[PDB]
């Protein structure tokens, strides 16, 4: 977590830089992907 760590989306797969991905969790490119992976799946 310094320069621009990559955060891959478990839902869509899209990968980006922490400062570009959802700061909330960072695991998903969007909050929807969070409520979706949670309300539609489990890990
Ligand atoms: Zn996504």
Short mmCIF file of N, CA and C and ligand atoms in Angstrom, two decimals:
data_model
loop_
_atom_site.label_atom_id
_atom_site.label_comp_id
_atom_site.label_asym_id
_atom_site.label_seq_id
_atom_site.Cartn_x
_atom_site.Cartn_y
_atom_site.Cartn_z
N UNK A 1 0.83 -1.24 0.00
CA UNK A 1 0.00 0.00 0.00
C UNK A 1 0.84 1.26 0.00
N UNK A 2 1.52 1.52 -1.11
CA UNK A 2 2.36 2.70 -1.23
C UNK A 2 2.18 3.39 -2.58
N UNK A 3 2.88 2.90 -3.60
CA UNK A 3 2.78 3.49 -4.92
C UNK A 3 1.38 3.40 -5.50
N UNK A 4 0.97 2.18 -5.85
CA UNK A 4 -0.35 1.96 -6.42
C UNK A 4 -0.67 0.47 -6.45
N UNK A 5 -0.87 -0.11 -5.27
CA UNK A 5 -1.19 -1.53 -5.16
C UNK A 5 -2.40 -1.90 -6.01
N UNK A 6 -2.37 -3.08 -6.66
CA UNK A 6 -3.46 -3.53 -7.52
C UNK A 6 -4.57 -4.23 -6.74
N UNK A 7 -5.81 -3.84 -7.01
CA UNK A 7 -6.97 -4.43 -6.35
C UNK A 7 -7.89 -5.10 -7.38
N UNK A 8 -7.81 -6.42 -7.46
CA UNK A 8 -8.62 -7.18 -8.41
C UNK A 8 -10.05 -7.36 -7.91
N UNK A 9 -11.01 -7.20 -8.82
CA UNK A 9 -12.42 -7.36 -8.49
C UNK A 9 -12.83 -8.83 -8.54
N UNK A 10 -13.30 -9.35 -7.42
CA UNK A 10 -13.71 -10.75 -7.34
C UNK A 10 -14.97 -11.02 -8.15
N UNK A 11 -15.73 -9.98 -8.44
CA UNK A 11 -16.97 -10.13 -9.20
C UNK A 11 -16.75 -10.02 -10.70
N UNK A 12 -16.20 -8.89 -11.14
CA UNK A 12 -15.96 -8.65 -12.56
C UNK A 12 -14.57 -9.10 -12.99
N UNK A 13 -13.61 -9.04 -12.07
CA UNK A 13 -12.25 -9.44 -12.39
C UNK A 13 -11.35 -8.25 -12.68
N UNK A 14 -11.96 -7.11 -13.01
CA UNK A 14 -11.20 -5.90 -13.32
C UNK A 14 -10.24 -5.54 -12.20
N UNK A 15 -9.00 -5.21 -12.57
CA UNK A 15 -7.99 -4.84 -11.59
C UNK A 15 -7.58 -3.39 -11.77
N UNK A 16 -7.34 -2.69 -10.66
CA UNK A 16 -6.94 -1.30 -10.73
C UNK A 16 -6.07 -0.91 -9.55
N UNK A 17 -5.76 0.37 -9.44
CA UNK A 17 -4.94 0.86 -8.34
C UNK A 17 -5.83 1.26 -7.16
N UNK A 18 -5.36 0.99 -5.95
CA UNK A 18 -6.12 1.29 -4.74
C UNK A 18 -6.77 2.68 -4.79
N UNK A 19 -6.03 3.67 -5.27
CA UNK A 19 -6.55 5.04 -5.35
C UNK A 19 -7.60 5.19 -6.46
N UNK A 20 -7.86 4.11 -7.19
CA UNK A 20 -8.85 4.14 -8.27
C UNK A 20 -10.04 3.24 -7.96
N UNK A 21 -9.80 2.20 -7.16
CA UNK A 21 -10.85 1.26 -6.80
C UNK A 21 -11.60 1.72 -5.55
N UNK A 22 -12.81 1.18 -5.37
CA UNK A 22 -13.65 1.53 -4.22
C UNK A 22 -12.84 1.55 -2.93
N UNK A 23 -12.65 2.74 -2.38
CA UNK A 23 -11.89 2.91 -1.14
C UNK A 23 -12.57 2.19 0.03
N UNK A 24 -13.89 2.04 -0.05
CA UNK A 24 -14.65 1.37 1.00
C UNK A 24 -14.03 0.02 1.36
N UNK A 25 -13.97 -0.87 0.37
CA UNK A 25 -13.40 -2.20 0.58
C UNK A 25 -12.16 -2.39 -0.29
N UNK A 26 -12.23 -1.90 -1.53
CA UNK A 26 -11.12 -2.01 -2.48
C UNK A 26 -11.11 -3.37 -3.19
N UNK A 27 -11.75 -4.37 -2.58
CA UNK A 27 -11.81 -5.70 -3.17
C UNK A 27 -12.66 -5.70 -4.43
N UNK A 28 -13.68 -4.84 -4.46
CA UNK A 28 -14.57 -4.74 -5.61
C UNK A 28 -14.53 -3.34 -6.21
N UNK A 29 -14.60 -3.26 -7.53
CA UNK A 29 -14.56 -1.99 -8.24
C UNK A 29 -15.79 -1.12 -7.95
N UNK A 30 -16.80 -1.70 -7.31
CA UNK A 30 -18.02 -0.95 -7.00
C UNK A 30 -18.72 -1.51 -5.76
N UNK A 31 -19.50 -0.66 -5.10
CA UNK A 31 -20.24 -1.07 -3.92
C UNK A 31 -21.26 -2.15 -4.29
N UNK A 32 -21.80 -2.04 -5.50
CA UNK A 32 -22.78 -3.00 -5.99
C UNK A 32 -22.16 -4.40 -6.00
N UNK A 33 -20.93 -4.48 -6.48
CA UNK A 33 -20.21 -5.75 -6.54
C UNK A 33 -20.09 -6.35 -5.14
N UNK A 34 -20.14 -5.50 -4.12
CA UNK A 34 -20.04 -5.94 -2.74
C UNK A 34 -21.36 -6.52 -2.25
N UNK A 35 -22.44 -5.77 -2.45
CA UNK A 35 -23.77 -6.23 -2.05
C UNK A 35 -24.22 -7.39 -2.93
N UNK A 36 -23.59 -7.52 -4.10
CA UNK A 36 -23.91 -8.60 -5.02
C UNK A 36 -23.19 -9.87 -4.61
N UNK A 37 -21.89 -9.77 -4.41
CA UNK A 37 -21.08 -10.91 -3.99
C UNK A 37 -21.50 -11.41 -2.61
N UNK A 38 -22.07 -10.51 -1.82
CA UNK A 38 -22.52 -10.85 -0.48
C UNK A 38 -23.96 -11.36 -0.49
N UNK A 39 -24.82 -10.65 -1.21
CA UNK A 39 -26.23 -11.02 -1.30
C UNK A 39 -26.50 -12.02 -2.42
N UNK A 40 -25.46 -12.43 -3.13
CA UNK A 40 -25.63 -13.39 -4.23
C UNK A 40 -24.58 -14.50 -4.19
N UNK A 41 -23.69 -14.47 -3.20
CA UNK A 41 -22.66 -15.49 -3.09
C UNK A 41 -21.99 -15.47 -1.72
N UNK A 42 -20.89 -16.21 -1.61
CA UNK A 42 -20.14 -16.29 -0.36
C UNK A 42 -18.73 -16.83 -0.60
N UNK A 43 -17.79 -16.42 0.25
CA UNK A 43 -16.41 -16.86 0.12
C UNK A 43 -15.77 -17.04 1.50
ZN1 LIG B 1 -16.76 -5.33 -10.10
#
